[PDB]
Symmetry: C6
Subunit: 63 residues, 6 copies
Amino acid sequence: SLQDPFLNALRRERVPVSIYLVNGIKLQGQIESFDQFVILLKNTVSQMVYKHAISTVVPSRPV
Amino acid sequence: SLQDPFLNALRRERVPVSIYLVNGIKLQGQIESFDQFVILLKNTVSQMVYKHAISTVVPSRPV
Amino acid sequence: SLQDPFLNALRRERVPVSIYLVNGIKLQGQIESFDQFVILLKNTVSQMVYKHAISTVVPSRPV
Amino acid sequence: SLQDPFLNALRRERVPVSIYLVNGIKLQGQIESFDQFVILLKNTVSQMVYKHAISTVVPSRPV
Amino acid sequence: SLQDPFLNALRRERVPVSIYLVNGIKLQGQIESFDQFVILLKNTVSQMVYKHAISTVVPSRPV
Amino acid sequence: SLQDPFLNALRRERVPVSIYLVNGIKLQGQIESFDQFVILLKNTVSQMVYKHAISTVVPSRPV
């Protein structure tokens, strides 16, 4: 399983990520937390993103 | 695990939220209730939103 | 479970609803019936709507 | 399950239906066959439609 | 029960098909292979199409 | 199944692929890794792509 270690790295390293949604919208922030269905992306406020609506998670720099 | 405590906080605190749909539409209101598949968003009327159609849930202020 | 009591109320009360689809289209009618996957929306004819394509169900008045 | 008796009627009665897709596209023809995942819509040729891509099935007249 | 015989025919007969995606995009080629999640569509190269992203499979002539 | 051998080939051969997303976006890079839900596409950085958001995987040359 790749998803947990990948999201976990981005979390620990408080890396600025771009979460791209299935509709094309680009969300940005740091990954605050995550579970099986959602990812909490912190920014001005924490927003709960559903994984099912995420197409791709792009770190802003190598990890 | 994240989703339930997160939606639960927004509920108790009767916090104005913006639910963004996969189609880009922004719904607004307070979270009245929720289960495994839907979230009741109260406004002028209660509307049943399917989670599968939700991309992101954004509280209008920190919690 | 919120979905079943919610759709059930709209049914019994023969309330005019607007079913919004993931593509943005707004369907209208009364909820004739429903099961795990589809909702029968009566109008001129009964049309079978797949829940997976529904974003939000909006009653035309409080219930 | 409402889906099977509903599609079955449309089949037996060889009723002209409009299948609306999640992308907004309107397909037309008669329902030739169907199973748990797909519907064969006959027209000039039989096309296999995935139910997951169908938003709504609209008969061209009451049944 | 319909999907396998249908794709199997298109395969054996090496029939030019149009695979329409949920996003509207039209793919073309012959069905090289398929299992239960994805379809190999041969063209200039073989491309793996996810069935979940396919709305409709349209043969270019009757079968 | 064919997904695993197909992605595995593209991996071993470090073949430039185009992953097309359900939103129309074309991702490019080499397949670094993959599991049941996601594909790590290496580029400038590794990005985690959800398979559910992938429509088609197109190698840049035959394999």
